[PDB]
Amino acid sequence: AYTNSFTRGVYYPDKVFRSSVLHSTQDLFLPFFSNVTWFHAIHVSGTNGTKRFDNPVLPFNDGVYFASTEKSNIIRGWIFGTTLDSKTQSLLIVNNATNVVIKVCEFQFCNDPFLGVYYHKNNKSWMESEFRVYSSANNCTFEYVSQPFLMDLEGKQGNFKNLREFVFKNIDGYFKIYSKHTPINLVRDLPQGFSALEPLVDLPIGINITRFQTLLALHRSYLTPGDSSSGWTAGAAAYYVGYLQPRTFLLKYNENGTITDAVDCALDPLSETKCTLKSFTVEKGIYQTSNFRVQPTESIVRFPNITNLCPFGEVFNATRFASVYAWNRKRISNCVADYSVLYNSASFSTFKCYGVSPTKLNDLCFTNVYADSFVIRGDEVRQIAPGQTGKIADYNYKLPDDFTGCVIAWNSNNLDSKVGGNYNYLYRLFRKSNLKPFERDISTEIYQAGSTPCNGVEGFNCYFPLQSYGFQPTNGVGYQPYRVVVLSFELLHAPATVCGPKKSTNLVKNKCVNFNFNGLTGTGVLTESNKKFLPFQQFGRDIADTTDAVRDPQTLEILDITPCSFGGVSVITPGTNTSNQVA
């Protein structure tokens, strides 16, 4: 069945005393009066009704609220896991008695996720029989066995007096279990008892959790004529599940220090009014709380159809790289550059860049890309950096201060250091002036050190500027030839050519979607544009630098971007002491 959550979904996010403050918290909560799915595991009392048994698989979102109404400790434990197989780990909890023993060990009992509490003949009473239903190998990491010894079941048929409230939330490989206990009265639904959930257990588990399962103890008196598991007429426990939502609660503490009341910030317009006003006393009058924002429906991605792999195989490993005094320009144009192989081929000693980030390199597009590959000393690998003044590398190769693009360096000991002497690698040692970043002085003249014309002759203070590298086959760590290649990612808004392919969703009009045009992560409706767009780049701008008119790369249709319906709510409310209806 389905019911509403009256006073459930609140827990201390970070425990602080918070003596009589109206705090504003943002965490994973359960919105009030929402759908909470009743799982009434009642014993079937009729010959026609179905056997009420509730251990179904429940998808596990980013957070889960759980509630167990109880009178005889029937509901015991919970289980998690991505798919509940030998491939993925599966947590579990056991509450056979007062002692709380738990595990993380993957034990596959998909056919029988049950537990057994059978009526023992010896000193006949309600005892536990089968707390072990595990039928697999462990291959596990974590363990926990708490043993306060107290044997208590206390079977009864009266009203469900106790209720345990839990929150199982996981983030950053950590599992947090908030728990609290409350004596309830009503048997058919959740009573109006407000309280928060104190944290008890935090466990590092490091497992992707997507599913959820529960354990029920089903076995009855031996006097029952038949199988106690197939036929059982004493089970009455029930439990409720609530998929936690990212909310922003306002928690009102008291003098004692516990959360007495709470208010949502999206439940009702008056609730949002109390959220903004930061109090529970909202007097008569118009209030302005938020704006009527329409969320995007889908996510259009627009990358060029063609899938020509960019020639990145011949830029990283090649036969010969020209020396630093004369470096090559590899212009990569109109192709797809799948960086997965550039991630698979991970042998780079140094990889730094100051513009785009390597995380977003895959889902980003570029218009011009130029690669400069060469070879340098072992101590020069740190000297190819913007702003880094080079003692000898400023004559040779400088990087722009506005440079955007990533550099790659790796040890070329196995390819460029050989017994052949490899003196063909040269570099400039001194010059009358320091070069600009993307200028290379491939010229080779004589140096007039000491203010004397050494025209053609190399004598004292007339040394040859183009000195060969002092390489040695398998030298020390600081003198190995390091082979490097830099990429100048031109981020100027021009028709993007060099980037990986994503799905090209069809164009849609008059529907604001989280579209993405070569990194342009805009969320607005699309329309046809009357004004003739430029034959050049597919980008447009306005006074506020928010793109207004663009053009698709695949089809030359002039698209107009406009953020969809935006307004502002204004809660018209009388005094809360008088009513709660607003306009």
């Binding site: 513009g355 980030s357 995380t359 977003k360 981020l491 992560t521 506020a544």
Partner: protein, 49 residues
């Protein structure tokens, strides 16, 4: 809104599409303090007027 304010761009959609949170947060902090300063200046001028 068309002011760099020290960041490498001027629109919030071309910073999160380039950098990652741990390095984009400083650029966002620059942009937000600049825009908050501008809006506070506007509010003060409006109050005086």
């Amino acid at each position: 809104l068309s002011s760099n304010f020290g960041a490498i761009s001027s629109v919030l959609n071309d910073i999160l599409s380039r950098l990652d949170p741990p390095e984009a947060e400083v650029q966002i902090d620059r942009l937000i303090t600049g825009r908050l300063q501008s809006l506070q200046t506007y509010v003060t001028q409006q109050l005086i007027r």
